[PDB]
């Protein structure tokens, strides 16, 4: 067959919640380990602290998931997004599209038009 690429990971299902628990930590660790390496690959002018902050928030939005089959789709997406980033397939515009650098009240929203 054709060779899987450098960070290609075989798609496998989580055995139990302990499996998923350990994989999510492995994925979060691997992301924040790579933040210094992302910065010089993509010439990020922000410091690495901001990059790791964004990694933390992406993981935090899936914090309250209690379904193995939703976590494994999520562990799939991060694996592909990690592989995509580390092999430098995406470019600076894609990585900067990921950093964003709604009205806070009804009355603020009303006065400007909806938002």
């Amino acid at each position: 067959a054709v060779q899987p690429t450098k960070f290609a990971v075989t798609v496998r299902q989580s055995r139990n919640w302990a499996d998923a628990k350990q994989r999510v930590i492995a994925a979060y660790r691997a992301w924040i380990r790579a933040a210094p390496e992302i910065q010089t690959m993509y010439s990020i002018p922000f410091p690495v602290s901001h990059i790791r902050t964004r990694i933390r928030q992406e993981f935090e939005r899936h914090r309250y998931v209690n379904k193995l089959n939703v976590v494994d789709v999520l562990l799939q997406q991060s694996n592909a997004d990690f592989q995509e980033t580390m092999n430098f397939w995406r470019q600076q515009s894609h990585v900067m599209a990921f950093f964003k650098e709604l009205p806070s009240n009804f009355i603020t929203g009303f006065l400007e038009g909806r938002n």
Binding site: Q22, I25, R29, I32, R33, R56, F59, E60
Partner: protein
């Protein structure tokens, strides 16, 4: 390396972390979760910070074992890099 040397730098880093509940609770036998108030992701960041400071790579199998300051000290002595 020296045990006191590989512990003094940890206290500065751990106190330097933004949102530990209080810098006094760091001891030689303190736990990140029970004492220092760090959740799963905060603890993974702490091992990540420790590895960067000591310029060593902490593997997935023994990275999980570091849930307390003493475990970090023993691993740092065990691994031959500084």
């Amino acid at each position: 390396l020296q045990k006191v040397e590989v512990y003094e730098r940890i206290k500065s880093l751990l106190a330097g972390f933004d949102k530990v509940n209080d810098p006094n609770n760091i001891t030689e036998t303190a736990h990140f979760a029970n004492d220092l108030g760090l959740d799963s992701l905060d603890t993974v960041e702490v091992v990540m910070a420790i590895e960067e400071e000591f310029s060593i790579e902490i593997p997935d199998k023994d990275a999980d074992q570091i849930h307390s300051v003493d475990k970090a000290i023993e691993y740092i002595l065990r691994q031959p890099d500084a």
